[PDB]
Amino acid sequence: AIAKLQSYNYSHMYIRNANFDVRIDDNVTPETDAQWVLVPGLANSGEGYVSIQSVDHLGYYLRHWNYDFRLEKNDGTRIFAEDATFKMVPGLADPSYTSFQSYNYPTRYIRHYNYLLRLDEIVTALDREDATFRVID
């Protein structure tokens, strides 16, 4: 499914590709920078696992490299797949929304740190809000 990923706590902002960097922003141009294909997890086909593919750069996925995020072309490896697969879980700040738990670092979640996208431990209530997104498809 093609989706937009809206920040729970900054609801005018969306996860977007910015010349292969990853950030949240409002007023996203081109609009396809903010559009993603949620596909079955590259590292696991089971229920709830997803990989997040860029719409305007097919074959490119949100991939964490340690705790940073990049939009990277799939090199076919299991390690890439694991760094690019997330469990979609009920929102940490509000279960009606969505959070993205890392497949290979299960205590870490996708979160925006200000405008940047990171894979962090989620300790505080603000961390939970930074790690919660509305999936709009």
Residue numbers in the entry: 7 to 143
Q: What text comes from the article?
A:
Here, we describe the structure and function of AtAbf43C, an uncharacterized GH family 43 subfamily 26 (GH43_26) α-L-arabinofuranosidase (EC 3.2.1.55) from A. thermocellus. We solved high-resolution crystal structures of full-length AtAbf43C and its individual carbohydrate binding module family 42 (CBM42) and GH43 domains, including a structure with L-arabinofuranose molecules bound to the CBM42. The predicted 580 amino acid protein consists of an N-terminal signal peptide (residues 1–19), a CBM42 domain (residues 29–160), a GH43 domain (residues 179–488), and a C-terminal dockerin I domain (residues 511–568). Taken together, we demonstrate through structural and functional characterization that AtAbf43C is an active arabinofuranosidase, specialized in degrading AOSs to arabinose in an exo manner.
To determine the biochemical properties of AtAbf43C, recombinant AtAbf43C (Residues 21–511, lacking the signal peptide and dockerin I domain) and truncation mutants AtAbf43C_CBM42 (Residues 21–167) and AtAbf43C_GH43 (Residues 167–494) were expressed and purified. At the optimal pH and temperature, AtAbf43C and AtAbf43C_GH43 had specific activities of 4.95 ± 0.28 U/mg and 5.67 ± 0.63 U/mg, respectively, on pNPAra, while AtAbf43C_CBM42 showed no activity on pNPAra, with U defined as mM/s of released pNP. CBM6 domains commonly bind directly to polysaccharides such as xylan and amorphous cellulose, while CBM42 domains typically recognize small AOSs or the terminal nonreducing arabinofuranosyl residues of arabinan or arabinoxylan. Additionally, three of the four uncharacterized A. thermocellus GH43 proteins contain CBM42 domains. Previously, Ribeiro et al. expressed these three CBM42 domains as isolated truncations and tested their binding of various natural substrates, finding they most strongly bind arabinoxylan and arabinan. In the previous study of this CBM42 by Ribeiro et al., residues D39, D91, and D136 were individually altered to alanine. While versions with the D91A and D136A substitutions showed significantly decreased binding affinity for arabinoxylan and arabinose relative to the wildtype protein, the D39A mutation, which corresponds to the α pocket, did not significantly affect binding.
